[PDB]
Design a protein around this ligand. Structure first.
Ligand code: FAD
Ligand code: FAD
Ligand code: SJU
Ligand code: SJU
Lengths: 381, 388
């Protein structure tokens, strides 16, 4: 219970028309920045337009770790995800826990003291770790989940690697956020800045979650890693919201509004790089160019990074990483597992890649001009 | 008693009957002689070895055209080889009354176009259409059966009357388990409607992953006898398995309306195929599958006597043509195959494509196992009935 937590609850289903004015103002860039971003985005898109096995990095963490050397030398880093989610039995949640535990040991040993920015890390889904994650009361779920996540966080602290909590459906944002707060106030994890958390910009609550996390970082002394994404579950959220007869949804219903929300939330994160580590996860060259110029000329490893999904982001970020390009780092999200554990992730990649509104679809669409692809969302909204 | 009391009571009783209680009758009905099993194994081995190597050892490929005119032009090649077509104007789960009206006009336009292209070839050799009832009512899964039926029935009857006037097939696709009962009641009213007399093009899908499947087939076969219609029956395994599992979990069910072990669906399919093959005087079985072992089993179960119109196989565009190029035609198995042909753009491909990904990407699917290095040809041709 706090003023910052109340802003989150109040925004849950705020009407879309009332959410946007503060985002538009925050996402408005100076003419100089807009012109520079348009130039960079054009260069990236011209390069791209000259360019489920593809989505999985390896079957095992040993296999995926071996395959990461080539791109790590080019300026990429990795976040490994042992595939698995939505556990329905205690046995499944225990197996996912042991998968994550063994991955941390292997990743942490491979990190070899490179630390949380230059070395690899791990991503986890809370729904893999509790057999009734979405069907039981949030209070009891968090309490049974807490010792498992704390144990994993303690292992990540032992090796000094990143451990990110992925974001899933909207009705579990609050639970996962409460877990993040308990961990960041837990003295057994002091001195480790590897805890990471995803916030989804297609959510109406996003900037208020970001206010809460930035303040939590500042008062806890933890430099929380914050992965800003647009979001992967849009079709399911819409279908659930429609089934519930809800007049106002927890997510935006126009893609341009999510784009404006992302840029507005990026501005908020870039103003807080003292206390959080922003991670800008996107495959959209206009979004990337905007953030690249919003961040200014000062850069050091550990200030911020970009991120991308394995099999989707490499052609864009080959134009970004390295000293002959933009000299900014990118962390590749690397799924690890069998084809069967991959299926649910694959479905969301199909919804992402196949949507006519998606950047990665439009980049191949002969009816979509480069002019349209470099359009600034605020000037279009 | 209430009309068809016993048949209707059997369907309701099976709805959520324990899986272990459903299987013994299906296994016995699915049992075939050793001679037939050896012959089917040899046929299945031949089909798989031909599959690979005509295709080097191995989602626009699922759509036949953006418009029905474009799709009909593209059908000429495979029709010349002896395939037929069932066109589906992509669209489902209408959320508005206006959307339901748009889908109805798409189906209506398509029947005129398909009927002209058919040019009197009839329901077996000529093309037909498939429809989804969820496209035609704006709250199909949410509204009371009274309201849905009373509004849906005139629209489906109007479409059936058009299909009768051109003598083409009109198939009702099967969707989620909770709409089986409504769709079956609609089938009954249409088959008893005298305005549709003399046309045998009405078709209906039954999903063998459902516990009700054999009792639904008993009801349909009896309906064909008392109505005098030869009902076209498409036997499938089922496309919504992942969604059905999730829905039953959220409904708090102790027992699901579908099987949870994949080989149980295989046994159910073969047992239901045996029931259909014994009733070809009053139904037209349509065996929809991409599984070469299932195909071979039904090919040998059906015996040596065949004529076009007895039964057919079916496949999805973009999935089944390589298998059935080893089936259609005098030098192959000399059995016909109807290709299900989606028609539309990306504004309508979505829901169907997700179900294709779940089908193609599942470790348990034949189309995935045929490319899996861990699966021997021995396993691909194994009779599932022998495993249980
Ligand atoms: C490294 C990485 C990690 C990620 N982690 C997560 C995670 O933990 N949880 C999560 O949910 N997502 C996560 N995502 C995001 C998700 O997987 C997609 O990759 C991302 O949303 C695509 O955005 P884009 O900027 O690349 O592309 P764009 O094409 O610019 O944006 C597409 C996005 O717009 C949104 N959208 C589409 N249509 C509409 C509409 N009508 N109304 C409103 N919004 C709409 C959706 O969010 C969609 O994904 C992650 C992405 C990356 C790269
Ligand atoms: C022409 C045609 C029309 C079709 N029409 C419809 C329709 O109207 N409605 C519909 O629902 N389906 C329909 N289908 C079926 C669906 O689209 C799939 O193509 C079909 O189920 C795949 O079965 P298969 O015999 O080709 O493959 P197989 O690999 O032999 O069987 C796979 C099937 O097994 C089932 N299954 C998978 N895992 C399990 C499990 N753990 N427990 C139990 N069962 C399991 C599922 O039904 C899955 O699709 C149609 C198929 C075709 C070819
Ligand atoms: O799982 C998803 O589809 C979204 C996502 C990508 C990386 C982490 O989460
Ligand atoms: O729509 C689905 O996925 C199942 C299906 C295939 C053909 C008719 O229905």
């Amino acid at each position: 219970q706090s003023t910052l937590r109340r802003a989150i609850t109040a925004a849950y289903r705020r009407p879309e028309t009332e959410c946007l004015p503060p985002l538009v103002e925050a996402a408005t860039q100076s003419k100089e920045i807009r012109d520079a971003a348009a130039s960079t985005a054009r260069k990236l898109i011209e390069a791209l337009r000259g360019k489920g096995e593809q989505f999985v990095t390896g079957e095992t963490i040993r296999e995926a770790l071996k395959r990461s050397k080539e791109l790590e030398e080019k300026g990429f880093s990795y976040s490994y995800d042992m595939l698995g989610e939505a556990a329905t039995t205690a046995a499944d949640a225990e197996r996912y826990y042991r998968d994550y535990e063994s991955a941390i040991h292997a990743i942490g040993k491979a990190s070899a003291g490179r630390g949380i920015y230059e070395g690899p890390g791990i991503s986890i889904k809370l729904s893999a770790l509790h057999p009734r994650y979405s069907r039981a009361q949030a209070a009891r779920v968090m309490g049974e989940l807490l010792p498992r996540v704390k144990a994993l966080a303690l292992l990540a602290k032992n090796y000094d690697i990143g451990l990110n909590i992925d974001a899933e459906e909207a009705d579990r944002l609050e639970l996962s956020l409460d877990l993040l707060e308990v961990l960041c106030l837990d003295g057994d994890l002091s001195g480790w800045n590897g805890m990471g958390f995803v916030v989804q910009a297609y959510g109406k609550r996003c900037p208020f979650v970001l206010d809460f996390i930035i303040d939590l970082a500042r008062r806890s002394g933890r430099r929380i890693m914050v992965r800003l994404v647009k979001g992967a579950y849009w079709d399911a959220e819409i279908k659930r919201a429609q089934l519930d007869g809800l007049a106002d949804f927890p997510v935006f219903t126009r893609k341009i509004h999510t784009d404006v929300s992302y840029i507005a939330c990026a501005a908020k994160l870039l103003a807080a790089t003292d206390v959080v580590f922003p991670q800008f996860a996107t495959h959209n060259a206009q979004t990337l160019a905007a953030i690249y110029h919003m961040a200014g000329k000062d850069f050091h490893v550990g200030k911020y990074e970009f991120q991308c999904l394995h099999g989707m982001g490499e052609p864009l970020y080959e134009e970004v990483v390295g000293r002959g390009k933009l000299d900014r780092p990118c962390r590749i999200y690397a799924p690890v597992g069998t084809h069967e554990t991959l299926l649910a992730y694959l479905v969301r990649r199909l919804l992402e890649n196949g949507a006519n509104s998606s950047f990665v679809h439009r980049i191949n669409d002969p009816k979509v001009s480069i002019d349209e692809l470099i359009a600034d969302p605020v000037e279009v909204v």
